């Protein structure tokens, strides 16, 4: 009812882009929550990277791996779109650095590194199960995980499932406060999402975010927004199976974000 | 020779993406300059926005229009991807604000506003002619200027021509120092290009940039980079007529940028 307008904006976009669109919104202050197609499956694309760097930090707390330990970059390890790591062939990087890279620029080689240090796609999925995400699953590394094929279960989440997961990572007790704060910073210091929700963020609000794009037009973001008076709100927006232009898909996300934000500013 | 490697990276990309790629690089300290297909035509897409906000500032210096004067946003004026302006239907905006918006987020409605206050696509083209750009031309407003059709002359530049234009705007005398500094800031405070040259910028270097995407896979950036020891270098990269994914096109730009940057750091 509160989110009626959001719903109409979503329905319009779903028509104009001939797409599948999924949205979920969690208000942490009270326990209000809203979804459109919140149970449908969409490809994670790069929205997954949050989960693997939350694993790294968790697994470090348990003493199973050192984030100041360095991996060595070989030319043949490189995949499409690795700005940070392609500058460093024949140098070593701290996993800590590699998470900074993949969370802030979405460097894909850096993501593959992080994945190898936390038990692969199966490690990430097991982890999700242990915090009580029952839907989200990683199955492949970069770049094939972006394939985004219809009816393919691999590398998918639901808007609601990942919104809950992100809720628990940042505000639940799975992680130490310091490590929650680190993960927050990675997401707050994201450099590659100014064209999405940040571009419609109310003045003075904060935002921690992670976005995704891939195949058959998949486009998504998962974000936390908060402010002096507004307790954390978790937003999860996934598009898929569209031929819209990236620009059209980005436009869809900032319209939906603005409606969502409007709910909480009037 | 110095740029041999850059050239090989460009040739590779041109093959892998089955694309037309154009590059131009101006070193302002000495007068060195380099291009690949630097005379070929490519669509401006959003790389044009710089020219129209340089017009606004120039035309203000001449007393022909006030940048603290406000236009009124009507719902029916809105075009695809206008984050700032869609937040403000039934409010007024200073042209100054509208340039900030279109230069920092690439809001398209804001660009159309700026265009209407500087004599339209014909005003922009006349202006380019008067600073001695003979190739660059704007012919349409948003969004049709992004059409990027083969052999279409409208809304095109050459890598070299726009690189020279940007050179003159920032470092020539067409504009007052204060207004050069304003235009610099608009470009320095660009929020929507972290995934391009910024993601491979050498530590401590500065960057002022404006990027573009549109039709039949057009992708471009025009940027100035400088530092304590490195005098301004102007970079102009244009891709066109490709079916590559946005991610592939972004990857192409950061590879080429890194080669270019490498020239000047070893």
A→B interface, C-beta within 8 Å: 80-81, 83-84, 86-87, 105-106, 191-195, 198-200, 213-214, 246-248, 250-251, 254-255, 258
Phi, psi of A27 (to 5 degrees): -100, 110
> DSSP 3-state assignment of B53?
helix
Q: Using an 8 Å CB-CB cutoff, list chain B residues near A250.
A: 81
Of B105, B213, B251, the CB nearest to A81: B251
Cα distance between residue B52 and residue B40, in whole Å: 22
Burial track A33-48 (b if 16+ CB lie within 10 A, e otherwise):
bbbbbbebbbbbbbbb
Distance between first and last Cα of chain B: 14
CA separation for the pair A240, B56 (Å, rounded): 40
Take residue B46 and report the two structure tokens written for it: 């959003």
Pairwise CA distance, residues A151 & A160, whole Å: 19
Under a CB-based contact definition with an 8 Å cutoff, are residues B148 and B76 in contact? no
Helix or strand holding residue B7 (H, E): helix B4-16
Question: B249 labelled as ligand-binding?
Answer: no
Helix axes A177-188, A95-104, angle to 10 degrees: 40
Torsion of CA A248, B187, B238, B252, to 10 degrees: -80
- Best B12, B81, B252, B261 residue to mutate vs chain A (most A CBs within 10 Å): B81
Task: Show the DSSP H helices in B66-141 as ranges.
Answer: 83-86, 95-104, 108-116, 120-131
Cα–Cα dist A220/A45, whole Å: 8
B127's tokens: 């202006």
Other Cβ atoms less than 10 A from the Cβ of B66: the count is 13
Task: Using an 8 Å CB-CB cutoff, list residues of chain B that contact chain A.
Answer: 80-81, 83-84, 86-87, 105-106, 191-195, 198-200, 213-214, 246-248, 250-251, 254-255, 258
CA atoms lying within 13 Å on the CB side of residue A159: 26
Contacts of B214 in chain A (CB under 8 A): 247
The 3-state secondary structure of chain A reads CCCHHHHHHHHHHHHHCCCEEEEEEEECCCCCEEEECCCCCEECHHHHHHHHHHHHHHHHHCCCCCCCCEEECCHHHCCCCCHHHHCCCCCEEEHHHHHHHHHHCCCHHHHHHHHHCCCHHHHHHHHHHHHCCCCCECCCCCCHHHCCCCCCCCCEECHHHHHHHHHHHHHCCCCCHHHHHHHHHHHHCCCCCCCCHHHHCCCCCEEEEEEEECHHHCEEEEEEEECCCCCCEEEEEEEECCCCCHHHHHHHHHHHHHHHHHHCCC
Please classify residue A31 by burial: count the beta carbons closer than 10 Å to its beta carbon, then call 0-12 exposed, 13-18 middle and 19+ buried: exposed
Q: How was this structure determined?
A: X-ray
**What's the reported resolution, in angstroms, to a tenth?**
2.4
Cα–Cα distance between A83 and A225 in angstroms, integer? Answer: 27
What's the number of CA atoms in the CB half-sphere (13 Å) around residue A261?
A: 26
The 3-state DSSP class for residue B264 equals coil
| Calpha distance B226→B232 (Å, rounded) | 5
From the list B80, B81, B192, the residue facing A194 with the nearest CB is: B192
CB A259 within 8 A of CB A12: no
> What DSSP character marks residue B175?
S
Burial class (CB in 10 A: 0-12, 13-18, 19+), B191: middle
| Structural domains in chain A, sorted by start | 4-263 (3.40.710.10)
Q: B95, B118 in Cβ contact below 8 A? A: no
Do residues B60 and B66 make contact, with C-beta atoms less than 8 angstroms apart? yes
Chain B residues with beta carbon closer than 8 angstroms to that of A86: 200, 254-255, 258
Reference A258, options A230, A266, B102; nearest CA is: A266
Helix (H) or strand (E) segment spanning residue B55: helix B49-61
């Amino acid at each position: 009812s509160k989110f009626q307008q959001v719903e109409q904006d979503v329905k319009a976009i779903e028509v104009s882009l001939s797409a599948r669109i999924g949205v979920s919104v969690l208000d942490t202050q009270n326990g209000e929550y809203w979804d459109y197609n919140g149970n449908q499956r969409f490809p994670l694309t790069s929205t997954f990277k949050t989960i693997a760097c939350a694993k790294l930090l968790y697994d470090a707390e348990q003493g199973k791996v050192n984030p100041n330990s360095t991996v060595e970059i070989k030319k043949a390890d490189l995949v499409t779109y690795s700005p940070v790591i392609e500058k460093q062939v024949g140098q070593a990087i701290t996993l800590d650095d590699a998470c900074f890279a993949t969370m802030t620029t979405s460097d894909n080689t850096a993501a593959n590194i992080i994945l190898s240090a936390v038990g692969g796609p199966k490690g990430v999925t097991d982890f999700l199960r242990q915090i009580g995400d029952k839907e989200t699953r990683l199955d492949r590394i970069e770049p094939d995980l972006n394939e985004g094929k219809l009816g393919d279960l691999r590398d998918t989440t639901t808007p609601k499932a990942i919104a809950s997961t992100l809720n628990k990572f940042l505000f639940g007790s799975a992680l130490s406060e310091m490590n929650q704060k680190k993960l927050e910073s990675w997401m707050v210091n994201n450099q590659v999402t100014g064209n999405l929700l940040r571009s419609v963020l109310p003045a003075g609000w904060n935002i921690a975010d992670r976005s995704g794009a891939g195949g058959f037009g998949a486009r998504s973001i998962t974000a936390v927004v908060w402010s002096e008076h507004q307790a954390p709100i978790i937003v999860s927006i996934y598009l898929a199976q569209t031929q819209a232009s990236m620009e059209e898909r980005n436009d869809a996300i900032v319209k939906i974000g603005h409606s969502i934000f409007d709910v909480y500013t009037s």
